[PDB]
């Protein structure tokens, strides 16, 4: 089956959305911190991100995926624990890809937590 594809890891400010996608367009699996029953205040915990990464890695390794192109967004140890759990679960990596949202004074997010 699949042995090399694309995975898009979105380390949300309080979650981490991991979904394996094919370059042709289809996707393989998707698991959120809530899809496992840990939604509302535990998704922000990095171990929830690690467990979601473990889930997607194990299901896509049952699909046979050894390595994958990884477009990770969101900064912190969540984006590191995700790839750590990927490597531990047999889902190796080739490199980190950064097309990260670095706007040149672009849009405006909601106001700062004060």
């Amino acid at each position: 089956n699949v042995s090399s594809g694309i995975i898009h890891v979105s380390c949300s400010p309080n979650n981490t959305i991991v979904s394996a996608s094919d370059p042709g367009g289809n996707v393989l699996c998707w698991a959120s911190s809530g899809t496992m029953g840990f939604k509302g205040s535990r998704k922000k915990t990095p171990y929830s991100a690690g467990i979601a990464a473990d889930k997607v890695a194990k299901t896509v390794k049952e699909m046979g995926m050894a390595t994958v192109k990884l477009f990770v967004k969101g900064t912190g140890r969540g984006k590191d624990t995700a790839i750590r759990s990927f490597a531990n679960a047999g889902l190796s990596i080739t490199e980190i890809n950064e097309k990260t949202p670095i706007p040149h004074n672009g849009c405006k997010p909601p106001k700062r937590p004060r």
């Binding site: 915990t45 990095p46 171990y47 912190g76 140890r77 624990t81």
Partner: protein, 154 residues
């Protein structure tokens, strides 16, 4: 700021010749005085071997070894509440907590003779069914929940 201290315990009781039974004397102890408690402990040994034959040394060592807790929870607060982060413990805390649990559940049961209930507590702590192994299961199943914030530095 207090640093590490020694973990002192009175030398072995010459009736069974290990510091473990002496620590049991000291922690099952009520208002410590070794005038009468040693004869009652001899009787306790007797009721241990009489009920469902088990040499106290072997059963106690197996129970202590299996009940050994590994996880402890450090504290870091956000000024609104407090959470826990797991760390590791040495074998000294393991054995101290195991002896503590065996002694505390030895004194508190419900059957005619107190000798009988302490013997029965030893018997039910023998096969590592929940009398104190529940603590070992609970610490492992709850510190893994405190791994939630383990990968966060603040």
């Amino acid at each position: 700021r207090k640093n590490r201290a020694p973990k002192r315990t009175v030398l072995p009781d010459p009736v069974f010749n290990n510091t473990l039974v002496t620590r049991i004397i000291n922690v099952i102890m009520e208002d410590g005085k070794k005038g009468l408690a040693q004869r009652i402990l001899y009787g306790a040994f007797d009721l241990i071997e009489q009920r469902t034959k088990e040499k106290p040394l072997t059963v106690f060592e197996r129970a202590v070894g299996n009940v050994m807790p590994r996880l402890e929870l450090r504290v870091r607060r956000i000024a609104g509440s407090n959470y826990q982060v797991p760390t590791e413990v040495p074998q000294d805390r393991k054995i101290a907590l195991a002896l503590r649990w065996i002694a505390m559940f030895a004194r508190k049961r419900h059957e005619k003779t107190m000798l009988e209930k302490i013997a029965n507590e030893i018997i039910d702590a023998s096969n590592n069914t929940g009398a104190a192994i529940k603590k070992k299961d609970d610490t492992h199943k709850m510190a893994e929940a405190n791994k939630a914030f383990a990968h966060m530095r603040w």
